[PDB]
Amino acid sequence: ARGPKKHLKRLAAPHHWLLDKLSGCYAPRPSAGPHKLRESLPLIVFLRNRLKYALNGREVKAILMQRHVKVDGKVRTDTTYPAGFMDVITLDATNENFRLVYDVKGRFAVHRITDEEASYKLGKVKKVQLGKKGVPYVVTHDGRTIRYPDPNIKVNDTVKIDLASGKITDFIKFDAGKLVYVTGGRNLGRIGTIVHKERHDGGFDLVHIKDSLDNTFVTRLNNVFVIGEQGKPYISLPKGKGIKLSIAEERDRRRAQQGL
Amino acid sequence: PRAPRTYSKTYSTPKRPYESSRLDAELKLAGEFGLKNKKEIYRISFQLSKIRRAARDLLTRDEKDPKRLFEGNALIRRLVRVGVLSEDKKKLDYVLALKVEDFLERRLQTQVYKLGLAKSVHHARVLITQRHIAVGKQIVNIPSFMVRLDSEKHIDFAPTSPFGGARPGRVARRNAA
Amino acid sequence: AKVHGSLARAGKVKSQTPKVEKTEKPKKPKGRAYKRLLYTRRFVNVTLVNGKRRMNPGPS
Amino acid sequence: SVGFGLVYNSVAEAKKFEPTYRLVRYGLAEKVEKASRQQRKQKKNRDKKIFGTGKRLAKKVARRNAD
Amino acid sequence: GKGKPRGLNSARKLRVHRRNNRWAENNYKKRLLGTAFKSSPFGGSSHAKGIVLEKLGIESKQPNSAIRKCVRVQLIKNGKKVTAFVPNDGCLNFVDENDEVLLAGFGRKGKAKGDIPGVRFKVVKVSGVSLLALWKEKKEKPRS
RNA sequence: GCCCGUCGCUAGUACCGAUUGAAUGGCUUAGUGAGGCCUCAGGAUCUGGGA
RNA sequence: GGACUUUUACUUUGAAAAAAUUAGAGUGUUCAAAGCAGGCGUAUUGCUCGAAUAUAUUAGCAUGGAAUAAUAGAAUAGGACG
RNA sequence: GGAUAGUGGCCUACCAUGGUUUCAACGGGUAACGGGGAAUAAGGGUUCGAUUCCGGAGAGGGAGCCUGAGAAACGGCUACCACAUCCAAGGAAGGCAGCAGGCGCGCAAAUUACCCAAUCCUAAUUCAGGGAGGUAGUGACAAUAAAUAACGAUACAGGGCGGGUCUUGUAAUUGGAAUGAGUACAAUGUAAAUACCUUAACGAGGAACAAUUGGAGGGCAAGUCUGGUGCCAGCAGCCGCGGUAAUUCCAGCUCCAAUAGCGUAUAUUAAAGUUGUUGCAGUUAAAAAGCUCGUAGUUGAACUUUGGGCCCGGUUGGCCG
Numbered sequence A: 001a002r003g004p005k006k007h008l009k010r011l012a013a014p015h016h017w018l019l020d021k022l023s024g025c026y027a028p029r030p031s032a033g034p035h036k037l038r039e040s041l042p043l044i045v046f047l048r049n050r051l052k053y054a055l056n057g058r059e060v061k062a063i064l065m066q067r068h069v070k071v072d073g074k075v076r077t078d079t080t081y082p083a084g085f086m087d088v089i090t091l092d093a094t095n096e097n098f099r100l101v102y103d104v105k106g107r108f109a110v111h112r113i114t115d116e117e118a119s120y121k122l123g124k125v126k127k128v129q130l131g132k133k134g135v136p137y138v139v140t141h142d143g144r145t146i147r148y149p150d151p152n153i154k155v156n157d158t159v160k161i162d163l164a165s166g167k168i169t170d171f172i173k174f175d176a177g178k179l180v181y182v183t184g185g186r187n188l189g190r191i192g193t194i195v196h197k198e199r200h201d202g203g204f205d206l207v208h209i210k211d212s213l214d215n216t217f218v219t220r221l222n223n224v225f226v227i228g229e230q231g232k233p234y235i236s237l238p239k240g241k242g243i244k245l246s247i248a249e250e251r252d253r254r255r256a257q258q259g260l
Numbered sequence B: 001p002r003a004p005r006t007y008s009k010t011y012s013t014p015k016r017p018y019e020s021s022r023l024d025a026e027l028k029l030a031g032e033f034g035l036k037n038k039k040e041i042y043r044i045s046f047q048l049s050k051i052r053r054a055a056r057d058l059l060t061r062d063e064k065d066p067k068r069l070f071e072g073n074a075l076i077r078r079l080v081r082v083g084v085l086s087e088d089k090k091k092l093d094y095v096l097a098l099k100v101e102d103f104l105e106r107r108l109q110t111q112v113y114k115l116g117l118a119k120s121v122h123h124a125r126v127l128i129t130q131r132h133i134a135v136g137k138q139i140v141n142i143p144s145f146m147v148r149l150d151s152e153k154h155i156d157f158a159p160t161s162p163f164g165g166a167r168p169g170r171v172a173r174r175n176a177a
Numbered sequence C: 001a002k003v004h005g006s007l008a009r010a011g012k013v014k015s016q017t018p019k020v021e022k023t024e025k026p027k028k029p030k031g032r033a034y035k036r037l038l039y040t041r042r043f044v045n046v047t048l049v050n051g052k053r054r055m056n057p058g059p060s
Numbered sequence D: 001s002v003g004f005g006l007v008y009n010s011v012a013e014a015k016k017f018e019p020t021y022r023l024v025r026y027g028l029a030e031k032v033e034k035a036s037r038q039q040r041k042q043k044k045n046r047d048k049k050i051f052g053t054g055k056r057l058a059k060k061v062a063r064r065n066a067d
Numbered sequence E: 001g002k003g004k005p006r007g008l009n010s011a012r013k014l015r016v017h018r019r020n021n022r023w024a025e026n027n028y029k030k031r032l033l034g035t036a037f038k039s040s041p042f043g044g045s046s047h048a049k050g051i052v053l054e055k056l057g058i059e060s061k062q063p064n065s066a067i068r069k070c071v072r073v074q075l076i077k078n079g080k081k082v083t084a085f086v087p088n089d090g091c092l093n094f095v096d097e098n099d100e101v102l103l104a105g106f107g108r109k110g111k112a113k114g115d116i117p118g119v120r121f122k123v124v125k126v127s128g129v130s131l132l133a134l135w136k137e138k139k140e141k142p143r144s
Numbered sequence F: 001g002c003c004c005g006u007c008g009c010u011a012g013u014a015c016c017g018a019u020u021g022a023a024u025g026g027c028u029u030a031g032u033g034a035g036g037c038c039u040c041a042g043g044a045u046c047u048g049g050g051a
Numbered sequence G: 001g002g003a004c005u006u007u008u009a010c011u012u013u014g015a016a017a018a019a020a021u022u023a024g025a026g027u028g029u030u031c032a033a034a035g036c037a038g039g040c041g042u043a044u045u046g047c048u049c050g051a052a053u054a055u056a057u058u059a060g061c062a063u064g065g066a067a068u069a070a071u072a073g074a075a076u077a078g079g080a081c082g
Numbered sequence H: 001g002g003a004u005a006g007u008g009g010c011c012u013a014c015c016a017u018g019g020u021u022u023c024a025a026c027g028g029g030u031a032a033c034g035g036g037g038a039a040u041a042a043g044g045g046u047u048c049g050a051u052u053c054c055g056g057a058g059a060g061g062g063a064g065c066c067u068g069a070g071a072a073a074c075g076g077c078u079a080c081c082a083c084a085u086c087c088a089a090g091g092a093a094g095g096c097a098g099c100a101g102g103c104g105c106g107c108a109a110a111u112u113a114c115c116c117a118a119u120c121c122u123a124a125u126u127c128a129g130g131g132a133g134g135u136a137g138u139g140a141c142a143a144u145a146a147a148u149a150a151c152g153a154u155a156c157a158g159g160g161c162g163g164g165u166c167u168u169g170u171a172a173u174u175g176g177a178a179u180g181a182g183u184a185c186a187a188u189g190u191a192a193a194u195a196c197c198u199u200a201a202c203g204a205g206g207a208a209c210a211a212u213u214g215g216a217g218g219g220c221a222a223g224u225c226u227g228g229u230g231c232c233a234g235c236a237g238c239c240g241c242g243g244u245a246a247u248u249c250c251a252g253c254u255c256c257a258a259u260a261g262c263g264u265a266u267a268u269u270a271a272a273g274u275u276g277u278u279g280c281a282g283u284u285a286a287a288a289a290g291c292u293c294g295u296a297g298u299u300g301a302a303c304u305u306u307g308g309g310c311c312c313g314g315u316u317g318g319c320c321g
């Protein structure tokens, strides 16, 4: 239909952004950038909806134009910037830092983190191959290319990112028994750390996961994001650490906090 | 472009339209609880048939099926929280049996009468409307509140209502002038 | 059959009813107030039981 | 009567981060007006039909006083 | 088994046999053939406004004996001509032939109603005003 | 008692029918063929073989 | 990694799975249709729960079952194991 | 091979004779954009989806193309066809299936208004622009809540157990209470307004702030009241009413149903087990080919590891807590 769509109606918007229907007609169409459109979150909703710092959209532009906000290090003044899972948002005022991490309800949660933690990053490597001059590179879920990794990094593995500079130092591997993070379907949010991987040559390798409540589940490999060792992660998980409380579990504890 | 504003209907309608058995019967309920429309009756039959063929459907599931209890025990909580199902009856075979009048006796226009304080069942409906009685500071002019038996405790009049401690009121003030 | 029968008598009897005027009455109450009166009128003093009861007896 | 408000760490920060239709509600920014939105739209179109100054076409319209 | 094939694989036969046999339902063919639009002088529409050619008076069917006052109307969207009853006591005096009238069915699915032989429409408004509202003298007929 | 058909009146519907009848759309032969595009040339000029 | 695999239907579970709609939980929009809010203190400079669940079912994928209903196998052995 | 961004009969050259089809090809129809979905509530179904979201197609009808990352774009160009405007007659210009508004068509559908405040969008970009979008107006489309009254005293009367003191209340003088519909300082609301929420001042007794719409023979609730008419006029979805006491018409009265709504027409779903897989009917009511063969299709007897043994630990519920 004659080139690029540049609008986003409401109710085309990703559900996990949690926008009320009647506030107009449109969501903010996220821009092009590091994260897939449907798998991301733009700055204007973060600063307006989930975190309620700004009241209207006009204000969010006023905020960013003072170079207040940084993501993964950089000033990043795009009102609709596609900030995505595992990005870090330092905030210059308030000295706040947030890593971008799902709930087990599968939405993007607010999760404050240490100044120390605010300066590394991971990424599911999505591809590895030689390139120009034969210098190998990795590229990962977030949209960056790291030249000269170790030959031991194959694909589907996480990588520590310095993000004051480029390079990696550690690289957790994808094998039986490493901490994982489901980043799709809506086992989205659940956690933990292997059962095994069905090959299925032709497509769509299946990843079996056992949460640390002895509850199984399966999701596709494209959506499993290894994050380290049993009970030993490499970032700060959010509250309740994604173990898929039932509807009755969740409302039994909902009424557990009962007395004021 | 707009997002679609949801709506729904709140009243069903008797299929046989002239069943005089059910038609006198309907009015006895109407002129008892102080209703204006026979569709205030048709209304409160509607939810009932919803609760029933919500509830009736749950007792088909294998006994204590996962969701049958979640919304089972969610349901009977909702109805005692308004006080139509009595506290004996919270295991949901008896919610099939909420004869309609139970729902009407738990109105606001009704209890404002059964607490005394309404000379008639209609002195009730007339004062609820007219800036009169409340629960908190929260005035209520809806004779169909369905007061929830918790906030039934505080149903004294409002502070601005010149029947429960106020200024004289509009036509008294120059009957005296 | 025949389709061209006359048309003189168009409106023949409405024209020629002696058109008694309406006669003034008190003003009746409304949805609650009115259906209240029926609750009373229907159900608190039975009309009659001489056999069974009639809701509009003219000559009886 | 519930509402929502804000107080600023100065009054220069108020006058600079605040929507300007509020500084009108206060007396803190002046009401001074513009021509109704549809009027200036027309001026645009009127102006689109001129290429250049518009000074030097006054030249030749006063130059058919001869012709 | 007296009839229909019962095998688990006879679905096509079952479907085509209903598909075929549904044609004996008159509502089903009337809707599929499309008779509403082809036949049935109204455009299939709910109503159609026409122009009155003559005021007829039609001998009622038996065992009745009256003279039913109706109008021959020429549907203006169609050119079609149709005779239509003008019901109420009077209401012929309002029609004033060559006037503009609005026509409705009889609530009999065509199938002309009563003792009035072969008329399947009634006037609702002459001169675009609300016929009954003239019978009951709520309104006045306009100048023409 | 019931009842059938021709015959006659009024009205309505649809059928058949000279008019090699009319109309509206969808394709389409053959014939003619606009235009832009591609291309062989052209060379008002305007320049360093090019435009 | 190598070598070689009779073909199906059916049923299980599961993944993949847009919102709004629907079913439906929570929440007292003064009630209600709705909405996805809101609820708490120290109401002096904050505290905090949310925004569920269900639903796809024909086809494709994945997986457990081997009853039911098919297909194929050694008869001119041109069979089977070595 | 050419062309394409690239696969490909996409195109060409050469060669071959293939490809689909009763398991419905091919053709025709469509008052046909597809879907998410809507209506109808035993279920199985039946019907609908131009229409807020996704996809597609189009910009009067075709075709062609420039620019460009992206268009066969039309609020771009070019040509033809149709439509059609201005003129000094030489020429020039137009494309609302954008907003509004107009003609036409019809049963059928609103303002030629306000703003970038929100929602988002674009640019060189915090600023400009945005008939996207939002604001009001129009607006019984639908949907929700629900005013048109509420308490007396009395008076004959009933009945509770002579009226006494308990009200059933039917009362044709009464009675002090209450209130928004409206109106309106004000603040709120708003981009600026408007309403709503809140609230001074006003603002209810029958002349009102006065509820309707249908109906009262049957189905079907409510009179064989009165007057009119006299197979006339008219009613009547259907059975039927009127030809001189009309339970049906025209009225007055009284009465019923629903009630800020209610009637009518058209379609549609339920009822309909009258489309029947669930689930029909076929001797005589509609319906077994005159008869047998018979391809497609549908269907199709039975028999192949059953039975016995060891183990593991799961989930309800019991006696205990």
Ligand SMILES: [Mg+2]
Binding pocket: A028, A029, A030, A031, A080
């Ligand atoms: Mg954007």
Ligand SMILES: [Mg+2]
Binding pocket: D037, D040, D041
């Ligand atoms: Mg402008």
Ligand SMILES: [Mg+2]
Binding pocket: none
């Ligand atoms: Mg300019």
Ligand SMILES: [Mg+2]
Binding pocket: none
């Ligand atoms: Mg037939």
Ligand SMILES: [Mg+2]
Binding pocket: E072
């Ligand atoms: Mg005629």
Ligand SMILES: [Mg+2]
Binding pocket: E077
């Ligand atoms: Mg036409």
Ligand SMILES: [Mg+2]
Binding pocket: none
């Ligand atoms: Mg000719």
Ligand SMILES: [Mg+2]
Binding pocket: F038, F039
């Ligand atoms: Mg060429």
Ligand SMILES: [Mg+2]
Binding pocket: none
């Ligand atoms: Mg599942």
Ligand SMILES: [Mg+2]
Binding pocket: none
């Ligand atoms: Mg080839």
Ligand SMILES: [Mg+2]
Binding pocket: H017
């Ligand atoms: Mg051939």
Ligand SMILES: [Mg+2]
Binding pocket: H024
């Ligand atoms: Mg066929």
Ligand SMILES: [Mg+2]
Binding pocket: H032
């Ligand atoms: Mg079409």
Ligand SMILES: [Mg+2]
Binding pocket: none
């Ligand atoms: Mg269904």
Ligand SMILES: [Mg+2]
Binding pocket: H046
């Ligand atoms: Mg049907």
Ligand SMILES: [Mg+2]
Binding pocket: H049
């Ligand atoms: Mg559609």
